[PDB]
Amino acid sequence: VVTTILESPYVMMKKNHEMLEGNERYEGYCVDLAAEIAKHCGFKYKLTIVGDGKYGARDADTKIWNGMVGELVYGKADIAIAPLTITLVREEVIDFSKPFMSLGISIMIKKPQKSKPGVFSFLDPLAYEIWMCIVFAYIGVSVVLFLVSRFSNEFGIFNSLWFSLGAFMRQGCDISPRSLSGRIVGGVWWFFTLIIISSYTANLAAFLTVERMVSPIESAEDLSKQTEIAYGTLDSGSTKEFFRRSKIAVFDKMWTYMRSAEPSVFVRTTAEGVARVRKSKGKYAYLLESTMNEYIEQRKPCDTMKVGGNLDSKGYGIATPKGSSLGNAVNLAVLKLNEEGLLDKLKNKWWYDKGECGSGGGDSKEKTSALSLSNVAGVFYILVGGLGLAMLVALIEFCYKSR
Amino acid sequence: LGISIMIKKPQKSKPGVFSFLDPLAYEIWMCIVFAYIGVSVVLFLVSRFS
Ligand SMILES: O=c1[nH]c2cc(C(F)(F)F)c(N3CCOCC3)cc2n(CP(=O)(O)O)c1=O
Numbered sequence: 001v002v003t004t005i006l007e008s009p010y011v012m013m014k015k016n017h018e019m020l021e022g023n024e025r026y027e028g029y030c031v032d033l034a035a036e037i038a039k040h041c042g043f044k045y046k047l048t049i050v051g052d053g054k055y056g057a058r059d060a061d062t063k064i065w066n067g068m069v070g071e072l073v074y075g076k077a078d079i080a081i082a083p084l085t086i087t088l089v090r091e092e093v094i095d096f097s098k099p100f101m102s103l104g105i106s107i108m109i110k111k112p113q114k115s116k117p118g119v120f121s122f123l124d125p126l127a128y129e130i131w132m133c134i135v136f137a138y139i140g141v142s143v144v145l146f147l148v149s150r151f152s153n154e155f156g157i158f159n160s161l162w163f164s165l166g167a168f169m170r171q172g173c174d175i176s177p178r179s180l181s182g183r184i185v186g187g188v189w190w191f192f193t194l195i196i197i198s199s200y201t202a203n204l205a206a207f208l209t210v211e212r213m214v215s216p217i218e219s220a221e222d223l224s225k226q227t228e229i230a231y232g233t234l235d236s237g238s239t240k241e242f243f244r245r246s247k248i249a250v251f252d253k254m255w256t257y258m259r260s261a262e263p264s265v266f267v268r269t270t271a272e273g274v275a276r277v278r279k280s281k282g283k284y285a286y287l288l289e290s291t292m293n294e295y296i297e298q299r300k301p302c303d304t305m306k307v308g309g310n311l312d313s314k315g316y317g318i319a320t321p322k323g324s325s326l327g328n329a330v331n332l333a334v335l336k337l338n339e340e341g342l343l344d345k346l347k348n349k350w351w352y353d354k355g356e357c358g359s360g361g362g363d364s365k366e367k368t369s370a371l372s373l374s375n376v377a378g379v380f381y382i383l384v385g386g387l388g389l390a391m392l393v394a395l396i397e398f399c400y401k402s403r
Numbered sequence: 404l405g406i407s408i409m410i411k412k413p414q415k416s417k418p419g420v421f422s423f424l425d426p427l428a429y430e431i432w433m434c435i436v437f438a439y440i441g442v443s444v445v446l447f448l449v450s451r452f453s
C-alpha cells in the first residue's frame with residue numbers, strides 16, 4: 001500500500017486507462033522506481049494513489065496532515081514513492097530516504113530565436129567605433145590633401161572632399177593629385193578604403209552564412225541587474241516562500257522587484273506560466289523547480305529552454321513512517337540504486353528518450369534565404385532623405401543667389 | 404543481405420534561368436529600379452536652375 005501523485009513525468013495514466021488500470025499497468029518514472037525498489041526489497045505493494053491529490057501540509061488550527069503525509073502518519077499506507085521535497089516539517093513526522101534526486105529553482109526563458117532585422121542594420125558588420133573612425137578619417141584626409149595642395153591645383157576643400165568620397169565609394173575619381181605630397185595621401189587613402197570595403201563585405205558574408213544565437217540572460221545574478229526582463233514565480237508555494245524568506249543580496253533584490261511590480265507577474269498556475277513565457281517575447285522569465293523545467297523543455301512545441309544553474313538545492317525522498325520495519329530497508333536500496341547508475345539511466349530514458357525533440361538533429365539545419373526588403377530598407381530611407389536634403393539646399397542656394 | 408535504408412532519389416535540381424537574382428528578393432530589385440529613376444530625375448532637376 002504505497003501512495004503516489006499524478007505529476008505527468010513521474011506517474012502517468014497511459015492511453016485507454018480503462019483497459020489498463022491499477023497497479024498491473026501504470027506508466028511513470030516513479031512507477032519504475034517502485035518496481036525496482038520491490039525487485040531489490042521483495043514485498044507486497046499495491047499502487048494506491050493519494051486521495052487528496054496533493055502533498056503534505058498542516059493547517060494551523062486543524063493540525064492534521066493531508067495528502068501523502070496524512071496517508072503515512074495515520075497508517076493509511078505503507079510508504080510514498082513520489083516526489084517529496086525533503087524538508088524540516090515533513091522529516092519531523094516521517095522518516096525520509098537519502099535523496100534519490102537533487103534539484104533546485106531553475107530559470108525558464110523562451111528559446112532565443114532570430115529577431116526581425118531592424119532599421120539601420122546594414123552597418124552591423126562593422127563596430128560603431130570603426131564607423132566613427134571612418135568618418136573622421138575621411139574628414140582628416142580631405143583636410144590634409146587640401147593643405148598639401150595649397151602649400152605648393154584645384155584641390156580646394158570642397159573639391160577635395162568630393163575626391164576623397166569618390167575614392168572611398170569605389171567610384172572613379174574626377175581628378176588626381178599631381179605633386180608628390182598629394183600623391184602620397186591619395187595612395188594611402190586608396191589602400192585604406194580597399195581594406196575597409198573588403199573587411200565589410202567579408203564580415204557581412206560571415207554574418208549571413210553561420211548564424212549564432214545568444215541567450216539574453218545567463219544567470220539570476222545578471223537577471224537581477226537587467227530589470228528590463230520581467231521574471232515571475234508561481235502564486236504561493238516553496239518558490240515564493242523561499243524568495244520572501246531569503247536574505248542573500250541577489251535574491252533579496254529579485255524579491256523586492258517582484259513584490260512591487262505591475263501587472264501581476266506572479267502566475268496562477270505553472271501551465272499559465274509556461275503559456276505566458278511561450279506567448280510573450282524574451283521579456284518574461286519563469287522560476288520553477290529544475291526538474292519540471294527540464295521536462296517541459298523536452299515536450300512539444302520545444303519553444304522554451306533552461307538557462308543558468310540551480311539557485312537553491314533540495315532533494316526528493318521516499319517517505320516511510322517512523323516505526324516501520326521498512327524504514328531502513330529503503331535507505332540502503334536507494335543508495336545502491338544511485339550507485340549502480342540505474343536511477344540516472346531511468347531518468348535519462350524517461351526524460352530524453354521519451355523526448356519530443358532532439359538537439360543533434362536540428363543542431364545545424366542551416367538554410368539561407370534571400371535578403372528581404374526589411375534588411376535593406378534602412379538604406380532606402382537614407383537615400384530618399386539625401387534626395388530631399390539635396391532639393392532643399394538647391395532651393396536655399398537659389399533663393400540666396402537671387403538676392 | 405540485411406536491413407537497409409531506402410530514401411527518395413535526389414533529383415538533379417537544375418537551377419533557374421535567372422537564378423543569379425536570388426541573393427536579393429524581388430522587392431529589392433524593383434525598388435532599385437524605382438530609386439534609380441527617382442535619383443536620375445532629382446539630379447537632373449537640381450542641376451538645372453535658371
Ligand atoms: O512537497 C512538495 N513537492 C512538490 C513537488 C512538485 C513537483 F516536483 F513538481 F512535482 C511540485 N510542483 C512544482 C511545479 O510543477 C508542478 C508541481 C510542488 C511540490 N510541492 C509544492 P511547492 O511548495 O510549490 O514546491 C511540495 O510542497
Ligand SMILES: CCCCCCCCCC
Binds near residue numbers: 424429433435436439
Ligand atoms: C526581378 C527582375 C527585376 C530585376 C531588375 C534588375 C536591374 C537592376 C539594375 C538597374
